């Protein structure tokens, strides 16, 4: 679990979105596993606007943050699950690191701010859904 709070927006993994998220929907994209809903309070997370490939992520299954090198956002094949059929998930970045299903939503940050959230994993790898291209999150 976990979300990004920026301005009047809440960013979560689409497969973990609540009824409230869907009732206050701004934008969603199944291919990116992202959903953005509106909030009544002001969010203070800073979104990074950069091409960093190093950062730190929060891993709830270890209660620890880990430093990682990660790939550039791209289309990566993701195994079928209870939420989606087998497909290419876009805007995904992989890193060598520990992750478990309940880890989705953990933030990845670089020195410039929030980069994305944990969205996939398996076999000593962890995948992050990028949010750096969503320029509208700041306006
Ligand atoms: C951190 S998630 C994880 C980690 C280790 C092992 C397995 C997983 C599960 C995982 O990859 N998904 C199942 C739920 C849907 C999913 O989030 C997606 N974006 O399609 C993919
Ligand atoms: Zn950066």
Q: Report which of 14, 26, 33 is spatially closest to residue 90, judged by C-alpha positions.
A: 33
Q: Are the C-beta atoms of residues 122 and 79 closer than 8 Å to each other?
A: yes
In angstroms and rounded to an integer, the radius of gyration of the C-alpha atoms of the chain is 14
Q: Quick one: which ligand is closest to 132's CA?
A: 2
Q: Are the C-beta atoms of residues 17 and 29 closer than 8 Å to each other?
A: no
Q: Report which of 112, 66, 119 is spatially closest to residue 94, judged by C-alpha positions.
A: 119
Only one residue has tokens 């976990």, namely 2
Q: Are the C-beta atoms of residues 120 and 83 closer than 8 Å to each other?
A: no
Separation of alpha carbons 135 and 139, rounded Å: 8
Q: Confirm whether 15 is a catalytic residue.
A: yes
Cα angle value 130/132/19 (rounded, 5°): 60
Ligand 2 centroid to residue 85 C-alpha, Å:
32
Ligand 2 centroid to residue 7 C-alpha, Å:
20
C-alpha distances in angstroms, 7 versus 43, 74, 111, 132? Answer: 4, 27, 20, 15
Separation of alpha carbons 53 and 42, rounded Å: 29
Report the Cα 5 to chain-centroid distance in Å: 12
Annotated catalytic residue within 33, 45, 103, 130 = 33
Burial (CB count <10 Å: 0-12, 13-18, 19+), residue 15: middle
Q: Confirm whether 104 is a catalytic residue.
A: yes
């Amino acid at each position: 679990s976990g979300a990004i709070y920026v301005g009047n927006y809440r960013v979560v993994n689409r497969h973990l979105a609540t009824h409230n998220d869907w009732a206050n929907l701004v934008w969603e994209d199944s291919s990116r596993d992202l959903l953005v809903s509106s909030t009544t309070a002001q969010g203070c997370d800073t979104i990074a606007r950069c091409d960093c490939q190093t950062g730190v992520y929060y891993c709830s299954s270890r209660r620890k943050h880990y430093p990682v090198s990660f790939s550039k956002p791209s289309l990566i094949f993701v195994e079928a699950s209870e939420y989606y059929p087998a497909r290419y998930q876009s805007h995904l970045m992989l890193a060598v690191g520990h992750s478990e299903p309940g880890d989705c939503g953990g933030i990845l940050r670089c020195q410039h701010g929030v980069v994305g959230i944990v969205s996939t994993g398996g076999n000593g790898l962890v995948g992050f859904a990028d949010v750096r291209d969503l320029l509208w999150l700041d306006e």
